[PDB]
């Protein structure tokens, strides 16, 4: 009921698809950042929302800025998120799998960068 994901200095996540076993009551994403660049020029987060909500989450997050982890505080569209991390840093986020609803399309993404993938219930 966890996965390890990396974001590197080339604005790449090391996977584009996460699958969650339906047996999981909670699920944890462990984000790390190989590379040498710090958070103010190559910070990554891991953010989960519906596909429909992603644009607004990104737009509002970029308006909120670096010290808010490029996320709008208390954004109700964000199902789960990490903080923003630079190289060598780590953050984990856990969420309740019952938040993922039938028939919905979930995406994960980093808000400052063109980095995204899908999250699917198995
Ligand atoms: Cu990023």
Range of the domain at 52: 1-122
Q: How far is the CA of 86 from the centre of ligand 1 (A)?
A: 9
* E strands in 14-110: 17-20, 26-32, 47-50, 80-81, 90-96, 106-110
**H helix or E strand, kind and range, residue 42:** helix 39-42
Instruction: Quote the CA–CA distance of 94 and 2 in Å, as a whole number.
Output: 9
Q: How far is the CA of 28 from the centre of ligand 1 (A)?
A: 19
Q: Left if phi > 0, otherwise alpha if psi is -120 to 50, otherwise beta: which for 48?
A: beta
Q: Are 84 and 44 in contact (CB under 8 A)?
A: yes
Q: What experimental approach yielded this model?
A: X-ray
**Number of alpha carbons in the 13 Å side-chain half-sphere of residue 2:** 9
Q: How far is the CA of 106 from the centre of ligand 1 (A)?
A: 18
Rg (CA), the chain: 13
- Total domains, the chain: 1
Resolution of the entry in angstroms: 1.2
CATH number of domain containing 117: 2.60.40.420
Q: Which residues belong to the annotated binding site for Cu cation?
A: 44, 110, 113, 115
Q: How far is the CA of 111 from the centre of ligand 1 (A)?
A: 6
List residues, by chain if needed, whose CB lies under 5 Å from ion ligand 1. Answer: 44, 110, 113
Q: Are 75 and 82 in contact (CB under 8 A)?
A: no
Q: What angle do CA 112, 117, 120 make, to 5 degrees?
A: 135
Three-class secondary structure of residue 49 per DSSP: strand
């Amino acid at each position: 009921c966890s996965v390890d994901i990396q974001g590197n200095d080339q604005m790449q996540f090391n996977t584009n698809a996460i699958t969650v076993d339906k047996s999981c009551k909670q699920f944890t994403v462990n984000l790390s950042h190989p590379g040498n660049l710090p958070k103010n020029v190559m910070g990554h987060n891991w953010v989960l929302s519906t596909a429909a909500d992603m644009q607004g989450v990104v737009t509002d997050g970029m308006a909120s800025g670096l010290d808010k982890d490029y996320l709008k505080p208390d954004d109700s569209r964000v199902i789960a998120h990490t903080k923003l991390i630079g190289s060598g840093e780590k953050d984990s986020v856990t969420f309740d799998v019952s938040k993922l609803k039938e028939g919905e399309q979930y995406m994960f993404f980093c808000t400052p960068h063109p980095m995204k993938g899908t999250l699917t219930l198995k």
